[PDB]
């Protein structure tokens, strides 16, 4: 019996028999299909992390526009509670050469994410960093287990699959940067085939932003990802070992940050600019 | 990297995010994807055989209607000329419990239509004695000679479509034909995934033309136009025979009922009301 390879989250792919060019995927993000998703919980129920939408959008660029390109204005404002099976439909409609409107939805129909896919931006990779120089400039350690314990006090539960942040390094609240040691947990390394970035790794990077002292001081309570202004992968992210983040804005309502995922040599493998963290609507999880 | 099994012709399958329940497949019936389709030609152009639409419809029943079912009123529209890549979209929309409207289109031109039914508790027809069928149809018609005849009117069956070894008939007064027909060996490794391999089913359709009454009318080019009722009862991997019954044969066309049999004479697939005629070979 023949078979077709599929992205682990997007699932089965068709192009619709119409104009303009439009793509449709049907996937399953349930915990039976992806047991590691049981390890991202809000108020003790499994909820799809925002990092998963980021991966979906990233994975859609090549099939739709023919290049890995980048993703603009990704938003995900309606938390998805997971079941053993949780079907998702992903859509991409080409509006002009190099640009497509992207959507994710679940069955009553509920929108889960929107973005624009871009194939025409020839942005170049940011320059590499000296990991030693980054660490020297951020002398104060924040323990990953303690950071996750803090998350737990406000109802966000990261199990083993989402515990990839080992430690973060900061200076003071006046220096806007954080350097974190982060890696995909060992047991997930076999299954990261097919991902542009494994959502459990990307989420651990998002977590590291909260270690920043300015964020700790001012952005009080549940901070969850709500969107990302720009995402671009520059190569495989299999080897990510650090995340360098910059706090762009932080107030009582949330945080805006720019992130670079780095290999252990300091090479930039993925950029996420304008990550938004905020309270969101966790009312359904309650 | 994960993968998903797909039907060899229907291809990738999704359910649309809407009500009522509707399925969409996107496949490719081009000769690069399926080199064996190069071996069904009309005036030396590769053309999708009607038998392929029959398989698409049969294959769609279970995913849509959850279980065993059958196909009603399958009709083939403008004949589909094949290229290296020929995308096809198959649709099935549930209109009531146990019933769905079925369509095949290229892009837009409708290629086939049918109704899928899941709520028909049909009984499997009784098995036949192959030996008794053969004893009653003593007159052999050689498959190569039959295919040479088809050639004279522009229908070209290459190796993949040469599965009819011989047909056996009595006289024009007996409405039946018993054919020895098997999927050619090279295709038997791909047979996995098909309810019925279209190259096998087409060879069964060909056997109808061996009937003396059909021969007597001398219609010329006879191509499949539709099938009133298709039902599979088990795997067709071991089909070796086809018993056909001429229902009507005149200047307009031919209607026949077919049963695909294994060597034990067990009925594995029924195709009732096969319609053969002229169409639009232009």
Coordinates of C-alpha atoms in Angstrom, one line a residue, chain A residues 1-8 11-19 24-26 89 105 107 109 190 193-194, chain B residues 1-8 12-19 24-26 89 105 107-108 189-190 192-193:
Chain A
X1 CA 0.0 0.0 0.0
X2 CA 1.5 3.3 -1.1
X3 CA 2.2 6.1 1.4
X4 CA 3.0 9.8 1.5
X5 CA 5.2 11.6 4.0
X6 CA 3.3 14.2 6.1
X7 CA 4.3 16.9 8.5
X8 CA 3.6 15.6 12.0
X11 CA -1.2 16.0 8.3
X12 CA -2.8 15.3 5.0
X13 CA -2.4 18.0 2.3
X14 CA -4.5 18.8 -0.8
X15 CA -4.7 21.8 -3.1
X16 CA -8.4 22.8 -3.7
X17 CA -9.8 22.5 -7.2
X18 CA -10.3 26.2 -7.7
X19 CA -8.7 29.6 -8.3
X24 CA -5.9 22.6 2.8
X25 CA -4.4 20.3 5.4
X26 CA -6.2 18.1 8.0
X89 CA -7.6 22.3 9.6
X105 CA -9.2 26.3 12.7
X107 CA -14.3 22.0 13.7
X109 CA -16.0 26.5 13.7
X190 CA 14.0 10.7 17.5
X193 CA 12.3 14.6 11.9
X194 CA 10.0 16.7 9.7
Chain B
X1 CA 9.3 11.1 9.4
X2 CA 5.6 10.1 9.7
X3 CA 3.6 8.9 6.7
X4 CA 0.0 8.0 5.9
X5 CA -1.3 5.3 3.6
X6 CA -3.1 6.5 0.5
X7 CA -5.1 4.9 -2.1
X8 CA -3.0 4.6 -5.3
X12 CA -4.4 12.5 -0.4
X13 CA -7.6 12.6 1.6
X14 CA -9.2 15.3 3.8
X15 CA -12.5 16.0 5.3
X16 CA -13.7 19.6 4.7
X17 CA -14.1 21.7 7.8
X18 CA -17.9 22.2 7.2
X19 CA -21.3 20.7 7.4
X24 CA -12.0 15.6 -0.8
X25 CA -9.2 13.6 -2.4
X26 CA -6.4 14.9 -4.7
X89 CA -10.1 15.6 -7.5
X105 CA -13.3 16.4 -11.7
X107 CA -9.2 21.5 -13.3
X108 CA -13.2 22.6 -14.3
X189 CA 2.7 -6.1 -6.5
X190 CA 0.8 -2.8 -6.8
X192 CA -2.4 -3.7 -2.7
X193 CA -4.6 -0.8 -1.9

